[PDB]
């Protein structure tokens, strides 16, 4: 089950009523406007999270109460939301640098982390673009292809040091091999250098 949000200067009240009916929550109330475009479809947790994020920005907060009830109370520029799945790396490993990113961004941008290991981004398209660039880059970097290269003569831990000292490479003392990891270009290079020290 997936939800969408496309609002453009929609009266805050109307937004809250719309979201409550979608979520099967009673809403008790507050003034303002709201704009937001969902770049990806959101599940119910993410939709509800968006709702909280837009309310927080306008200066409001939610109080969940008896029997599925939510009381609203006082607390490039396009406002967008996006959910970025992360495939190779734990999402909280990105947290410190995503926080750094937002301290340059300015206000009204929010990164949310899901225990299913996806990050949700709410804010200005430019800020969201930057945050996506970084998530994806770190994600892709954690999925480098690995390759074992056996050594006939040299000691694996020496070659591990010597090249790790002047630069990933790891030794296997048991089988006396080196495990190099990177892209076709960088492994080609390392394969050759290792071969010459044999």
């Amino acid at each position, epitope marked *: 089950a997936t939800f969408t949000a496309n609002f453009k200067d929609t009266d805050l009240k109307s937004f809250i009523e719309t979201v409550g009916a979608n979520l099967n929550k009673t809403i008790i109330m507050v003034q303002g406007a709201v704009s937001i475009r969902t770049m990806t479809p959101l599940n119910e947790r993410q939709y509800y*999270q968006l709702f909280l994020n837009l309310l927080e920005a306008q200066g409001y907060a939610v109080v969940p109460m008896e029997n599925d009830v939510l009381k609203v109370v006082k*607390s490039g520029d396009e406002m967008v939301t996006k959910v970025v799945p992360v495939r190779n790396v734990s999402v909280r490993e990105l947290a410190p640098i995503l926080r750094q990113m937002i301290d340059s961004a300015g206000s009204g941008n929010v990164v*949310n982390y*899901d225990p299913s290991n996806v990050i949700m981004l709410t804010g200005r398209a430019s800020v969201v673009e930057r945050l996506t660039e970084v998530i994806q880059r770190v994600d892709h970097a954690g999925n480098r292809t690995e390759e074992v290269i056996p050594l006939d003569n040299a000691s694996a831990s020496e070659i591990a040091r010597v090249l790790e000292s002047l630069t990933q490479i790891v030794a296997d003392e048991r089988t006396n091999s080196v495990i190099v990891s990177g892209d076709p270009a960088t492994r080609d290079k390392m394969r050759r250098l290792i071969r010459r020290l044999d």
Partner: nanobody
Amino acid sequence: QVQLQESGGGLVQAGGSLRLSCAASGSIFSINSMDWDRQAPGKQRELVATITSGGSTNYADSVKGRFTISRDNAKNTVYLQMNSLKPEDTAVYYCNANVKTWAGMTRDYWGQGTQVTVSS
């Protein structure tokens, strides 16, 4: 909502110590972990230490044994006791609270930071 207010920064000599504090307020009940991280200009913000709501502590390799993270739930504050400070430690230290939201996701709130400077 959670608000964080750090303190304890200053200039110190190599081998000295400082004690950072951080007072949290707002939805304390939502806080499920609190950490210190640091940032020097031109470098990445990096995790230094963490104390969960269970009291479980976590420390970066560069600081383990020299820094201690600790808690005072009466005063709603966490502390970073920095001993044997090195020039490498020179950075703006931020206090961060990873809160649980009503939706079931998490969210970070953090303060303006406190500068620690270590001379030789």
